[PDB]
mmCIF file of C-alpha atoms in Angstrom:
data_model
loop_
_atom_site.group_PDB
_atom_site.id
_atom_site.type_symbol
_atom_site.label_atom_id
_atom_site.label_comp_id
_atom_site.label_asym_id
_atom_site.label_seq_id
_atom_site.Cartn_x
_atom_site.Cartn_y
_atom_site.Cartn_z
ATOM 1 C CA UNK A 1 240.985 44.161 67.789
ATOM 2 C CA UNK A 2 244.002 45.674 69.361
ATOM 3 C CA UNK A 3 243.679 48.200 70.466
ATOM 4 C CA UNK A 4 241.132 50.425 68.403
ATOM 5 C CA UNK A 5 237.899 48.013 68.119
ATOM 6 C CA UNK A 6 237.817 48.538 71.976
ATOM 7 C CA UNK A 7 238.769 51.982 71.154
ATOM 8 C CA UNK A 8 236.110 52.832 68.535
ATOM 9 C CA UNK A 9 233.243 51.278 70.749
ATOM 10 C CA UNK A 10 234.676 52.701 73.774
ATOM 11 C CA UNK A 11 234.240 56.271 71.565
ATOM 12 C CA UNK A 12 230.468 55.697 70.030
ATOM 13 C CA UNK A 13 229.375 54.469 73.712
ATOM 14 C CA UNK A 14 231.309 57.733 75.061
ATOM 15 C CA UNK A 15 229.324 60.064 72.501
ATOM 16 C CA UNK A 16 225.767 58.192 73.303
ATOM 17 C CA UNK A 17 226.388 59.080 76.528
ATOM 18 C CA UNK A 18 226.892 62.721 76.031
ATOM 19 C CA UNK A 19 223.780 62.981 74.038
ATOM 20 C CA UNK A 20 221.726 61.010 76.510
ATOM 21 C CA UNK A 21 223.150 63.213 79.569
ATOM 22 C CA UNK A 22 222.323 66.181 77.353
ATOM 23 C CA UNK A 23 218.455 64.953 76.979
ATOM 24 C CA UNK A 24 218.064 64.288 80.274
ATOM 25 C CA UNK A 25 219.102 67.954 80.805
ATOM 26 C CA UNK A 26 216.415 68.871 78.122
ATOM 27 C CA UNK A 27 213.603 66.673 80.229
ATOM 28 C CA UNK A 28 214.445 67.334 83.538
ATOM 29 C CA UNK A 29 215.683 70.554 83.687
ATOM 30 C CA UNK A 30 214.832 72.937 80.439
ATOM 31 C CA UNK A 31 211.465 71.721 79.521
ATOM 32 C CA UNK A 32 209.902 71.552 83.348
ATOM 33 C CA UNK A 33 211.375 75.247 83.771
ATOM 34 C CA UNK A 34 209.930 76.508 80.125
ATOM 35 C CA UNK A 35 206.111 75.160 81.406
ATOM 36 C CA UNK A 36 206.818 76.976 85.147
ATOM 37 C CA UNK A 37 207.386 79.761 83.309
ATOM 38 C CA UNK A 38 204.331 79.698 80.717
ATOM 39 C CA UNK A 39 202.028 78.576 83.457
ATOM 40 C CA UNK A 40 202.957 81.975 85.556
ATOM 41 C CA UNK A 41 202.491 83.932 82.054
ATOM 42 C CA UNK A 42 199.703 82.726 80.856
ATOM 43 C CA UNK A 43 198.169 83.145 84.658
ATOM 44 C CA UNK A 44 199.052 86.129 84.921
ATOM 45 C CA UNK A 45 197.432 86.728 81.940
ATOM 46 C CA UNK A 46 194.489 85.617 83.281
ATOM 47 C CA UNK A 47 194.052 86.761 86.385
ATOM 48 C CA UNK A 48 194.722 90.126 84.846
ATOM 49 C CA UNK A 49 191.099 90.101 83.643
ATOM 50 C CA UNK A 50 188.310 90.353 86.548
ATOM 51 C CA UNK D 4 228.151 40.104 62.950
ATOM 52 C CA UNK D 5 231.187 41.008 63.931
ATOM 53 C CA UNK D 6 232.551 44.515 65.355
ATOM 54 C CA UNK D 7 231.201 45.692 61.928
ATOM 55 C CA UNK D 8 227.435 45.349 63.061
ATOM 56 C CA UNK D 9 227.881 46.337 66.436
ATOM 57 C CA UNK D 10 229.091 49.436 64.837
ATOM 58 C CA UNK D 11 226.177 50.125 62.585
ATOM 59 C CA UNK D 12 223.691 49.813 66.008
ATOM 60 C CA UNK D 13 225.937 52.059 67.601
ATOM 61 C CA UNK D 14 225.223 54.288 64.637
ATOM 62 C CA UNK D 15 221.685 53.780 64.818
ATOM 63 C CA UNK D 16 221.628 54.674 68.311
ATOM 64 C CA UNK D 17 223.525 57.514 68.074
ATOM 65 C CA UNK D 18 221.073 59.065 65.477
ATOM 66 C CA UNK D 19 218.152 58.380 67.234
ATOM 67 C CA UNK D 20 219.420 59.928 70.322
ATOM 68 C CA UNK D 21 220.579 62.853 67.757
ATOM 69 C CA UNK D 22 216.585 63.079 66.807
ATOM 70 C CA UNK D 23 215.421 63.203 70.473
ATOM 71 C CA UNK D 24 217.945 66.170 70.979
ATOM 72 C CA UNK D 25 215.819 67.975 68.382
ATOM 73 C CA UNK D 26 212.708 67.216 69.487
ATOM 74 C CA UNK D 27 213.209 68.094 72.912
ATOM 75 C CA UNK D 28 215.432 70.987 72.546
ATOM 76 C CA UNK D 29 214.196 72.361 69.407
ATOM 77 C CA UNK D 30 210.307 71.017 68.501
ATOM 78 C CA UNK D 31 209.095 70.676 72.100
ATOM 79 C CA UNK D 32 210.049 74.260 73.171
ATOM 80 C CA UNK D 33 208.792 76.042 70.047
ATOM 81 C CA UNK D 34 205.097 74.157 70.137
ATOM 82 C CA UNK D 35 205.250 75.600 73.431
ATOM 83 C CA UNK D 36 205.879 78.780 72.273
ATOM 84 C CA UNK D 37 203.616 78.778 69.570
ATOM 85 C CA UNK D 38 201.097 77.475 72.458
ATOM 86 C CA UNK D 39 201.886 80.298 74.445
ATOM 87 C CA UNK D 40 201.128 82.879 72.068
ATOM 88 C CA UNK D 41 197.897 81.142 70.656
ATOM 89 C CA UNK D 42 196.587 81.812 74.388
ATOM 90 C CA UNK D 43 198.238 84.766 74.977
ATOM 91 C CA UNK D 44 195.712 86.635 71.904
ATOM 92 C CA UNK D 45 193.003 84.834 73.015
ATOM 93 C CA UNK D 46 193.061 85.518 76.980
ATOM 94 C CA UNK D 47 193.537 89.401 75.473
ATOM 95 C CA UNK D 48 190.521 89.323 73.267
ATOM 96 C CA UNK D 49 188.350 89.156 76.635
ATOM 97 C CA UNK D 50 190.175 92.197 77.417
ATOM 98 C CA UNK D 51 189.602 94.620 74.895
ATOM 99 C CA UNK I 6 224.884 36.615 69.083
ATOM 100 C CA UNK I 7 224.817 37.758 72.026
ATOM 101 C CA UNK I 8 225.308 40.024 75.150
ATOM 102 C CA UNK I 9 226.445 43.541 73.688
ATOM 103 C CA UNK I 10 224.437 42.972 71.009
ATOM 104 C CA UNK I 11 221.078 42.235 73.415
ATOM 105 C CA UNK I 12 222.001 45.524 75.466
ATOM 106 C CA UNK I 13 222.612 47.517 72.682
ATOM 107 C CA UNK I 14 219.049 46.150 70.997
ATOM 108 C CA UNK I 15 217.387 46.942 73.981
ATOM 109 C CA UNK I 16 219.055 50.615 74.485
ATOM 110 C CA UNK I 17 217.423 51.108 70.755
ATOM 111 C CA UNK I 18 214.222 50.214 71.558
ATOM 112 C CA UNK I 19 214.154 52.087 74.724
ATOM 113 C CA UNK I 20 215.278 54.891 72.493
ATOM 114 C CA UNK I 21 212.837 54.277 69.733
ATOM 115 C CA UNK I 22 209.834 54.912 72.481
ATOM 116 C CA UNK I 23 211.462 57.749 73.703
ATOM 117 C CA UNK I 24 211.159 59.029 69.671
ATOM 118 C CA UNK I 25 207.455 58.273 70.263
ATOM 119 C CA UNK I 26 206.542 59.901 73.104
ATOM 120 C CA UNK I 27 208.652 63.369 72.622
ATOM 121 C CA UNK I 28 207.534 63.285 68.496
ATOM 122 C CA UNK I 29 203.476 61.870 69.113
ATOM 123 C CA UNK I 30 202.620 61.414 72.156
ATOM 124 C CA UNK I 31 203.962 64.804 73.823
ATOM 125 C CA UNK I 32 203.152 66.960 71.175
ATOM 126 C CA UNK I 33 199.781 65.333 71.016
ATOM 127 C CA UNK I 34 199.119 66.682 74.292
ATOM 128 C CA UNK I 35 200.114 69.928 73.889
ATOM 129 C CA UNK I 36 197.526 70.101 70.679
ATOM 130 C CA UNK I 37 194.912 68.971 73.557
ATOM 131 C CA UNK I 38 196.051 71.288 76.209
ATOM 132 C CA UNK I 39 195.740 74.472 74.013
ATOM 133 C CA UNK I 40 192.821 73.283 72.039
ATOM 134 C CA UNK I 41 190.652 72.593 75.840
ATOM 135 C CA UNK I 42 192.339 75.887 77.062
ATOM 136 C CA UNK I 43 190.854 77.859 74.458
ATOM 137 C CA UNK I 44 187.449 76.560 74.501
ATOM 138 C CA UNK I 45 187.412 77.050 78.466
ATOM 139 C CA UNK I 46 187.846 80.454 77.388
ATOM 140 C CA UNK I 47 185.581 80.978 74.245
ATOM 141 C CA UNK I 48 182.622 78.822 75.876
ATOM 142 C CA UNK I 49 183.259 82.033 78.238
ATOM 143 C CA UNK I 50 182.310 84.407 75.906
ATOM 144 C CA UNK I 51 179.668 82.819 74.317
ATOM 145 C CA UNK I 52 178.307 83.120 78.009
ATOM 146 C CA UNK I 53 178.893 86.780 77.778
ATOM 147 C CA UNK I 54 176.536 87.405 75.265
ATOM 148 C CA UNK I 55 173.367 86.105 77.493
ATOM 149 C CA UNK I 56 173.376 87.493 81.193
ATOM 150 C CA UNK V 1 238.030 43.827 87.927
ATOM 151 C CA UNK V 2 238.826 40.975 85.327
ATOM 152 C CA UNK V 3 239.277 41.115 81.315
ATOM 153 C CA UNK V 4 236.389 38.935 80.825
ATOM 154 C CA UNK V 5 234.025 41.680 82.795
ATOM 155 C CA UNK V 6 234.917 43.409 79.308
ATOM 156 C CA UNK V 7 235.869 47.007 81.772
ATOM 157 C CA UNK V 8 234.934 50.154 79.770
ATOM 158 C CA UNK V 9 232.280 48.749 77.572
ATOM 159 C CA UNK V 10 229.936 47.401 80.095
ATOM 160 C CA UNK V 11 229.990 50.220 82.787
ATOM 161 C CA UNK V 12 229.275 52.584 80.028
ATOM 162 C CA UNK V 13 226.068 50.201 78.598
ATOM 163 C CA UNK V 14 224.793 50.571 82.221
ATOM 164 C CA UNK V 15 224.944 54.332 82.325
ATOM 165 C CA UNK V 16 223.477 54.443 79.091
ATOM 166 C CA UNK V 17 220.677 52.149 80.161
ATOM 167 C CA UNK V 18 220.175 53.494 83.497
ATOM 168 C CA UNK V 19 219.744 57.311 81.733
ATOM 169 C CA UNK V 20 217.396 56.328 78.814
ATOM 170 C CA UNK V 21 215.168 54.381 81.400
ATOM 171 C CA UNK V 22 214.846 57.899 83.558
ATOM 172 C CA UNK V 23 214.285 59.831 80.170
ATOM 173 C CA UNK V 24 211.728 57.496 79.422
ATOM 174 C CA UNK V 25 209.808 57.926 82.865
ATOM 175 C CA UNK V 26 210.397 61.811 82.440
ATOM 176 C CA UNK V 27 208.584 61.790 79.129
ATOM 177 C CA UNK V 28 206.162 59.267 79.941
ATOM 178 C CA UNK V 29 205.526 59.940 83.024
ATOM 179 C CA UNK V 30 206.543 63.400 85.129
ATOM 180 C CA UNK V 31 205.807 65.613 82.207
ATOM 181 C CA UNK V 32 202.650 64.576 81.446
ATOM 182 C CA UNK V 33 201.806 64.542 84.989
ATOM 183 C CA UNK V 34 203.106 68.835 85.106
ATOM 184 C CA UNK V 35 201.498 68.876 82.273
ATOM 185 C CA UNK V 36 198.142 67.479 83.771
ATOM 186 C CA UNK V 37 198.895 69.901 86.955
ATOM 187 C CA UNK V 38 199.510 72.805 84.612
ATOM 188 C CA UNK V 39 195.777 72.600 82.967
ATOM 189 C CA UNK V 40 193.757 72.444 86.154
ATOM 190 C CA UNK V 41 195.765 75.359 87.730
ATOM 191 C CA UNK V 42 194.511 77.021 84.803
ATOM 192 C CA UNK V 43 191.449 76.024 84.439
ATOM 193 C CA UNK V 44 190.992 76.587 88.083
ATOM 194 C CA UNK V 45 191.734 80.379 87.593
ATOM 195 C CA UNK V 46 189.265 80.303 84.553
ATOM 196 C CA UNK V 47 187.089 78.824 87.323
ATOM 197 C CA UNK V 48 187.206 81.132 89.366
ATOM 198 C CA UNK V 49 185.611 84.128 87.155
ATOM 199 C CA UNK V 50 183.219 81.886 86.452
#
């Protein structure tokens, strides 16, 4: 209903968005680097022992 | 169900989205932490 | 009802299995991960104390 | 593109789809498969003194 209902939607679909492109981030990106970086640690550790 | 209810799933998808930013950027990388550590002692008890 | 409303109900329950595997199903395999990691390494010392 | 297409509301429903759908094969899917690669690499090096 003109123009706002368009405009609200438009504004809850804009945030979802956001969020969603913001966990994608999280999956793709920070999480895969944060187990790189505890697999090296940890084998380190590891190989640190014979 | 008019714009009304459409509203209220837009709501409900927001916050669920809103929950998955926690868990991923919040619970995920602490249990990971907390992971780490756990490990981390236990690899060192062979040591000493 | 009706197109935006079948989209939307579908984006939810995509989203509602996303809840599940990043709250149960994830986390559950961490839990596994650590708990086979550390026996890998404890069965290893109870092999220590014979030979 | 015409009125009836509905414009704003409907491009942004795609992205939204097409984003959850990738966030649901990264957390279904590639994680548990680093996941899976980041135990045997592990193991392996536990292996290996063994």
């Amino acid at each position: 209903s003109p123009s706002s209902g368009l405009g609200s939607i438009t504004d809850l679909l804009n945030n979802i968005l956001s969020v969603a492109n913001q966990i994608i981030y999280n999956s793709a990106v920070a999480l895969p680097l944060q187990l790189d970086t505890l697999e090296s640690t940890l084998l380190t550790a590891i190989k640190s022992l014979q």
